[model samples]
Target: SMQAIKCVVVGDGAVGKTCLLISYTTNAFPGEYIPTVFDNYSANVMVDGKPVNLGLWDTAGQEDYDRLRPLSYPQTDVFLICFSLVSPASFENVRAKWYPEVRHHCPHTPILLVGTKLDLRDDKDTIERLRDKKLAPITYPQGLAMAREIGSVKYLECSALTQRGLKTVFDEAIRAVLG
Candidate 1:
C-alpha cells in the first residue's frame, strides 16, 4: 500500500511557484508563466530511497485571504513554503507573516523553505554592492537568514527557469517527510 504525502506550495503569486512545481514533477521548465487563477499540480516521487506519492496543493497568495488559508488543507504531511529571490519583500513576507500562520494551522506538518530564481543570484555580487543604496531589497543573505529562522526550514535554492536544484529539493523533502 502506498500513501500520499500532502505537500502544499505556499508563496506569493507570479513568484515562480507554479514553475517550481512543474519543474519538480515533470522536469520541464515553463519558459513562460501562465497566470494561475486557481490550479495545482502533483507527482509521486521516489527520493532518498523512499517511495511516496506526493499530493501538492498550490494555494493562491494574491488576496490576503488569511481566514481561508487555514482551511486550505486541514490534513497535510508536509508544507513547501516558496518565494522568489528576485523579490526580497515576498521572501520576508513569508517569514514575517505566512510561515507563522501556516505553522499555527498545520502545527505537526513539516515546513520546507524553497527560494526560486536561483539564476537571479548570478547578480549576487551586484546586489550586495547595491544593498547600501537600498536599490536591491532582497539580497541573498536576508532570504537565507529568514529561511533559517523559520525553524523547520529545509532550505533549497532552486531555479525553475533552468531546473537547478530541483532534484536536491525533492531529495531532501522526501528524506524528511519519509524519515
Candidate 2:
C-alpha cells in the first residue's frame, strides 16, 4: 500500500489534456467544460492486486518557455504525451518537441501517447474550422504509427465529454510502471 507512481502529462494548449484528467477523476465532463487551473491529482488504484498511489502532473497555464518547467522532470515514473486528433500541428509537436524534451531528462521512463478530443475529430464545427486550412483529423493509423516512431508504450484516443476510452488510458499507465 506504500507504492507510488509519478506520471506527467504534456501537450499543446487546448488539446483537451485538462478535460481528460477532469473526466477521469470526476466521472463527469461538465457541459460547459471551461479551461481552468487544476492542481495535481492523485488516486489510489489496485493494479495486479497491488495498491498504487497514482500521481498526475500537468503543465497547463504555464508559460511555454518557463525556465522552471523541467524541475518536475525528476522522479517521473511515466509520461502521458498528448495531442489533439483534429490538429496536425499538435501531432507533429509530439515528435518535434515533447519527445525530445522528455528524453532530455527521463529517457528511460515509459510514455503513453494519447490522442485527445476524439469527439471533435468528427464534429462539424471542428471540421469546418480546418476546412479553410485544408487539413484533416489525425487518423488511427497515423497515431499508432507515431506511437511506434517515438517508441511509445501505447497509443490511445479519448473524449472528455463522452468519456470514451478515458479510463483505460490511465490504467495502462499504472500497468506500464508496475510491469
Candidate 3:
C-alpha cells in the first residue's frame, strides 16, 4: 500500500476546522462545539477512482497551543489553512498568523486555503451579527485574492453543516498532493 498523505488543518478558533473533518468522515454534523487540543483522523477514500488513505490532523487554534502546534508539522504533505466565511477576524488571521506559521515550518508544502461555514454567508442571523460588528461575510473574490496573495495551490469553500462543497475540499486536498 502507498503511504497515507498527511494533511494537517489549521485555523483560528471556532472556524469549523473540526466540523469540516467530522462531517466529511461521518457524513453527520456534530451538534456541539468542542475546542480541540490535538486530534487525528483517517479515511480510506477514492479520488478520481484511485484508493487513497488520507491522514487528517486537527490542531488547536487558540494562542495557548501556538508553542505546541509545530510538533505536528514534520512530514506534512499538504495543509488546509481555514477561515470562517463570516469571521473577518479569523480571515485576517490567515495572513497575520496561520500562513506565516505554516510557511516557516513547511515552506514547500502545498496549501489549500479553505473558507469554512459557507452556508452561513446568507444566513439572516449571521449577516445581522456581522453587520453589528461592521463586517460582512467574506466574498468569493476576497478568498481568491487571498489564495493568490499567499500562493496557496487552490482556494475552496465549504459548509460542514450542509456538506455543500465539503467533499470537493478534500478532493482538492488530495489533488494538491497527487499532482
List TM-score per model, in order.
Answer: 0.84, 0.91, 0.96
lDDT of 2 by residue, 13-94 (tens): 8787777777887798866755576458787777888778988887762455445667878999999999999999999999
Ten-residue stretch with the least lDDT total in model 1: 31-40
| lDDT per residue (tens digit) for residues 104-155 in model 3 | 9999999999999999999999999999989999999999999999999999
Error of 1 at 176 (Å): 1.7
- TM-score: which is higher, 2 or 3? 3
Better of 1 and 2 by lDDT: 2
Ranking by lDDT: 3, 2, 1
Off by over 4 Å in 3: 33-37
lDDT of 1 at 154: 80
Candidate 2 displacement at residue 103 in angstroms: 0.6
What lDDT score goes with residue 60 in model 3?
89
The best candidate by lDDT is 3
lDDT of each: 0.75, 0.86, 0.93
Better of 1 and 2 by TM-score: 2
What's the TM for model 3?
A: 0.96
